């Protein structure tokens with residue numbers, strides 16, 4: 001169950017797709033880990049997520065109100081901490097889908 005392996009390349013933190021050593025980001029609910037390169041994570045997420053309770057795409061929840069359901073599936077993932085936030089939970093309120101990288105209110109105050 002706690003097997004520290006990658007779901008994309010079946011490799012551990014000691015060996016990546018190209019035998020490259022790098023820590024693995026294991027889901028705090030499923031325990032499934034994956035390399036930042038395999039998960040297409042950002043340099044900030046790699047260091048920002050390794051120090052916080054990370055959740056996979058099927059576990060990611062809202063940090064503002066902290067809820068689940070249909071709206072929880074349409075939330076936005078932070079490009080700085082990978083925290084999910086409902087479209088309406090974003091601070092300030094989300095006007096429209098931003099073409100590019102999104103960052104939660106916890107990472108970018110108002």
Ligand SMILES: [Zn+2]
Nearest residue numbers: 006009035038
């Ligand atoms: Zn991998």
Ligand SMILES: [Zn+2]
Nearest residue numbers: 027030056059
């Ligand atoms: Zn999970």
Ligand SMILES: [Zn+2]
Nearest residue numbers: 062065086089
């Ligand atoms: Zn919310």
Ligand SMILES: [Zn+2]
Nearest residue numbers: 078081104107
């Ligand atoms: Zn954030």
